């Protein structure tokens, strides 16, 4: 006997039903941050219309933090935060332009959310990211130079200061920040390893993100022996603003 329907055809159709169900599941999970959307439709509706697209948002999940750190929920209602910028044009879809000195505006690649004002912790409950002054069990791996005492140069090759310490991850041993004693003001500021190139034979750290004089305004730590999530983002974002803001040419275009 012959039939057009066969088991291979049945099974492939069954797969499509599963797969489209899976995609809808995934798109819901994708909306646990950043939704509902900031639109001009919600503004004029007086907030009546929430823009969420399809599928709609999932019910909130809870993240229980260790060491009695509290509970995080997702999705969550997050308060609007003023933008320190003015639109270049009033038309929708236009960019904005930072107010004041761009490096210091907290806008564009200088921007960042306000992370929590407590430190990431080791499993045992100590501050995770700390200078080698504090975690004395750490050493420099034999074969590699000690960054302490190296001179830090900005994007234009001028001396910004000297490395005064190294900040390490106690959970997963690696350098996360260099501590820079800034020549101009004698403050000690963090420098993320992600923005640092070593010139080993010269014992120099090169920082392409900012000029030497920009080190004077790197955001400062409340406590010299630990760093909060909040301060980590403020530090890293300040260097990143330099990628677009630190010189005029960086605005573009090429042509």
């Amino acid at each position: 006997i012959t039939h057009y329907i066969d088991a291979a055809q049945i099974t492939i159709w069954a797969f499509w039903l599963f797969f489209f169900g899976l995609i809808i599941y995934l798109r819901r999970e994708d909306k646990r941050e950043g939704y509902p959307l900031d639109s001009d439709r919600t503004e004029r509706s007086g907030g009546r219309v929430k823009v969420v697209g399809f599928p709609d948002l999932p019910d909130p999940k809870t993240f229980v933090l260790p060491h009695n750190g509290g509970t995080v929920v997702a999705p969550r209602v997050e308060a609007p935060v003023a933008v320190n910028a003015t639109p270049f044009s009033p038309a929708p879809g236009s960019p904005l332009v930072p107010n004041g000195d761009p490096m210091l505006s907290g806008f564009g690649p200088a921007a960042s959310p306000d992370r929590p004002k407590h430190c990431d912790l080791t499993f045992e409950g100590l501050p995770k990211i700390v200078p080698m002054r504090v975690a004395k069990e750490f050493s420099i791996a034999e074969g590699d130079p000690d960054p302490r005492g190296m001179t830090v140069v900005g994007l234009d090759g001028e001396v910004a200061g000297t490395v005064s310490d190294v900040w390490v991850d106690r959970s997963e041993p690696q350098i996360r920040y260099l501590e820079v004693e800034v020549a101009a003001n004698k403050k000690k500021v963090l420098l993320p390893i992600g923005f640092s190139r070593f010139d080993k034979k010269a014992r120099k750290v090169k920082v392409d993100a900012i000029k030497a004089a920009h080190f004077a305004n790197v955001p400062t730590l409340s406590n010299p022996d630990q760093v909060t999530l909040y301060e980590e983002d403020k530090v890293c974002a300040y260097y990143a603003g330099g990628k677009l803001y630190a010189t005029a040419e960086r605005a573009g275009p090429l042509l």
């Binding site: 941050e33 950043g34 939704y35 509902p36 959307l37 900031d38 639109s39 439709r41 823009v51 993240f63 229980v64 933090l65 260790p66 060491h67 750190g69 997050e78 609007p80 935060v81 933008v83 320190n84 910028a85 270049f88 038309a91 879809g93 236009s94 960019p95 904005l96 332009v97 930072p98 907290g106 806008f107 564009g108 690649p109 921007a111 959310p113 912790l121 080791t122 499993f123 995770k128 991850d169 959970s171 997963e172 690696q174 990143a240 603003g241 330099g242 990628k243 677009l244 960086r250 605005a251 573009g252 275009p253 090429l254 042509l255």
Partner: protein
């Protein structure tokens, strides 16, 4: 609309070409010069694909014309045209769509560079996307050029390009023995293993067993040391995944590039250099 945290990142500038002229978004999409340029290449290419489906291989009235999604095929020219432009109905349509595709892909990558400049992030993603583009260009440009005809490109058809792969592969009798192909596949498989391991580990520590708090960096490291005696680290797994995926694309491009231009016999017979070493 914008993500609820997005407005504070929508900054002016960072373009490579265009400046204020095209420096705007359309809904979620950033446009810019390469958005406009890429849009034209893209819309043209797609519409020429639909036009090619409309007239088929031998005209819209023949039994070979079809809108069946699996059977639509836009094919390159006969090898006899060499490096010249064929007539539109004899493979030239494929050649124009190819140029559109390359321009759409490259414009997409440069748009990505402008977005990285706005966001002040590293350029790893457009750099990585360049490996996929490079493999596509080996297939439709470098390898056809080295053999002397654009007609060595693959056809633009969902199933018809699988026929191309099969017949190019079996020209070398047993294509599995291509050494760069073995290496590339090893990277594809290792990448899939590594991806499932990475996805699993992040989800299992952020969604722990009921009653448990969110797990730690120490848990992540401990877990794979417990299984294999080694943990590569949370930064390095992303280095590794990028290395495996780009290596898979790179050795792919190499393996088709040597198949024809740098080797014409069966692929098993390449291994005779090994068998013939004066050691055994």
């Amino acid at each position: 609309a914008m993500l609820s945290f997005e407005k504070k990142y929508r900054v002016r500038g960072g373009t490579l070409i265009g400046g204020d002229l095209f420096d705007f978004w359309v809904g979620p999409f950033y446009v810019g010069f390469f958005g406009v340029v890429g849009f034209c290449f893209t819309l043209l290419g797609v519409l020429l694909i639909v036009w090619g489906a409309t007239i088929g291989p031998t005209g819209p009235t023949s039994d070979l014309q079809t809108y069946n999604l699996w059977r639509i095929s836009i094919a390159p020219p006969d090898l006899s045209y060499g490096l010249r432009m064929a007539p539109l109905t004899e493979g030239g349509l494929w050649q124009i769509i190819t140029i559109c595709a390359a321009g759409a892909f490259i414009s997409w990558a440069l748009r990505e560079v402008e977005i990285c400049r706005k966001l002040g992030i590293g350029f790893h993603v457009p750099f990585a996307f360049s490996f996929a583009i490079g493999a596509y260009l080996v297939l439709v440009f470098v390898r056809p050029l080295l053999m002397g005809a654009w007609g060595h490109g693959f056809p633009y058809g969902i199933l018809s390009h699988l026929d191309w792969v099969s017949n190019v592969g079996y020209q070398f009798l047993h294509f599995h023995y291509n050494p760069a192909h073995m290496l590339a596949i090893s990277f594809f498989f290792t990448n899939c293993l590594a991806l499932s391991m990475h996805g699993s580990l992040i989800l299992s520590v952020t969604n722990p067993q009921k009653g448990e708090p969110v797990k730690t960096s120490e848990h992540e490291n401990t877990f794979f040391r417990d299984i294999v005696g080694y943990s590569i680290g949370a930064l390095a797994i992303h280095r590794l995944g990028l290395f495996l995926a780009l290596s898979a694309a790179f050795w792919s491009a190499v393996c088709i590039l040597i198949s024809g231009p740098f080797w014409t016999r069966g692929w098993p017979e390449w291994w005779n250099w090994w068998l013939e070493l004066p050691l055994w």
